[PDB]
Structure 1
Amino acid sequence: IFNGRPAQKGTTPWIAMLSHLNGQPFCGGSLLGSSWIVTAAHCLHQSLDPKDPTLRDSDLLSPSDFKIILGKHWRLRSDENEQHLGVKHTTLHPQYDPNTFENDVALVELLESPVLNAFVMPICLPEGPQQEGAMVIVSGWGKQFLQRFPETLMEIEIPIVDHSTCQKAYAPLKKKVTRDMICAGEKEGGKDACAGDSGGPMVTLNRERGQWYLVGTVSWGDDCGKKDRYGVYSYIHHNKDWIQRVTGVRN
């Protein structure tokens, strides 16, 4: 996360770290319901060879070759609270496109379900669509400016950008922003997600419910923290039906 601030311990109990067996983090995610983690589809497959730019099952990451850590706060150090959990299956959106990053969402079924508590509880699915200019919170353990990694989970608070002016901003640039994507960040730039934040949660507060809702997952952004350019997230309300069909989660 660029231009972020350290997340206060315990206030992001739905966040998941996707890590190699080794422990090296590579992506983030979110707990849905009892035993599912929603993340970016591009977190769960090898880099593709441009001379053969089509995703196959042979490129997918095996359940035995990564793990999930919930209730985590430090990037590399450890809690109490941490629950290290194996993977059962993985399912990337049926219409995921690895070249254009559309439908860049995936669901990781856990081999073992976490013990729900003050530090590990799920994020709610979104009830409706997002209003222009809503303040959301993007969280993650990825790189920051001058390319260090933080000791702690970092977070930014940024406004949602209207879909149209997001498309017009990314042309230049021959890059399409489709209906299944939502945009955040400000024109000046600065506050943005980056390498290692992929799949991390974008959430907002509902009132007067006091409930927190997942609006998007981190998908892509050209360069981290650079003006006239917005961060692009997978719009979860758009694929809510598919998530509900695979998961069977309900608020």
Structure 2
Amino acid sequence: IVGGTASVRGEWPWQVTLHTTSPTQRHLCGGSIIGNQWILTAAHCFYGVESPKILRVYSGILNQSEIKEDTSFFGVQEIIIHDQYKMAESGYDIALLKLETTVNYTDSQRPISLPSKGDRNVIYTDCWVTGWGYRKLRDKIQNTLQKAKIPLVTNEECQKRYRGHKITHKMICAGYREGGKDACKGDSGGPLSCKHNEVWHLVGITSWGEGCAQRERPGVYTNVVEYVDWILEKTQ
């Protein structure tokens, strides 16, 4: 996250850190808890991943340095990538992880609701992007989970900033005209969470953009509400 600030324990309890364990253990992507055995994340995170065997999902983490050799994690039973996925910029950047066991909910780990059925006309004015990703180009994964508040932009305006890409209604964009705050590499797969009537909803999945926090280059997110039928079918 560029231009963000440190989160605190329990602030974003649906946020997980997905690690790969080969050839080294590192944070690969973010994700969101949406059910007791289900993480919603981005398909592009799994580039070059040979099988779910090398993945670990850690929940209830604030600092990456908290993760030691005895820290509990969930194994991944299955990775479900959208069948239309090709590359992040072309859409369908969505995947589910089915965990090997259930998540017990606590103040540090709980699910986030999807955008509600019937809420098409809701205008989201309080959206936040969170993650352990880069804070600038050529950075490293950050220790403390970062947060930044970002305004949504219209798909019409987003298309004007990305004339070389097809910005579809299965995507949503968020950014400032002068940049400064944005998601970046390593934040991918995590949530764009918006609070409405004091309830947080998972509105976007961090997906792609041109650089990070550049002027007039908003971040592009998978528009979760357009995938509710797909999510419900895979998790039912």
Q: What corresponds to 2:212 in structure 1?
A: 224
Distance (whole Å) between structure 2 residues aligned to residue 130 and residue 93 of structure 1: 26
Q: Deviations over 1:93-126 (max 9, x none)?
A: 1211226431100000001222211111101111
Q: What corresponds to 1:135 in structure 2?
A: 126
Q: Which amino acid aligns with 1:151?
A: N
Q: TM-score, normalised by structure 2?
A: 0.91
Q: Which amino acid aligns with 1:202?
A: L
Q: What corresponds to 1:49 in structure 2?
A: none
Percent identity, aligned pairs only? 37
Q: Which amino acid aligns with 1:26?
A: L
1:185 aligned residue (175, 188, 199) = 175
Distance (whole Å) between structure 1 residues aligned to residue 211 and residue 218 of structure 2: 9
2:38 aligned residue (32, 36, 39) = 36
Distance (whole Å) between structure 2 residues aligned to residue 130 and residue 176 of structure 1: 23
TM-superposed CA distance for 1:212, in Å, is 1.2
State whether structure 2 residue 11 is matched by structure 1 residue 11: yes
Distance (whole Å) between structure 1 residues aligned to residue 141 and residue 173 of structure 2: 24
Contact 1:101/1:219 (8 A) holds in 2: no
Distance (whole Å) between structure 1 residues aligned to residue 187 and residue 132 of structure 2: 6
TM-superposed CA distance for 1:205, in Å, is 1.1
| Unaligned stretches of 5+ residues in structure 2 | none
| Unaligned stretches of 5+ residues in structure 1 | 47-59
TM-superposed CA distance for 1:65, in Å, is 1.1
* Greater displacement, 228-237 / 145-154: 145-154
Distance (whole Å) between structure 2 residues aligned to residue 190 and residue 149 of structure 1: 18
**2:151 counterpart SS class:** strand
* 1:162 to 1:132, Cα distance in 2 relative to 1, 3 A: farther
1:96 aligned residue (75, 82, 85) = 85
TM-superposed CA distance for 1:131, in Å, is 4.7
* Greater displacement, 160-169 / 89-98: 89-98
Runs of 4+ in 1 over 6 A off after TM superposition: none
Contact 1:35/1:112 (8 A) holds in 2: yes
CA RMSD of aligned residues (A): 1.8
Q: What corresponds to 1:20 in structure 2?
A: 20
1:145 aligned residue (136, 145, 152) = 136
State whether structure 2 residue 157 is matched by structure 1 residue 168: no
Distance (whole Å) between structure 2 residues aligned to residue 101 and residue 19 of structure 1: 25
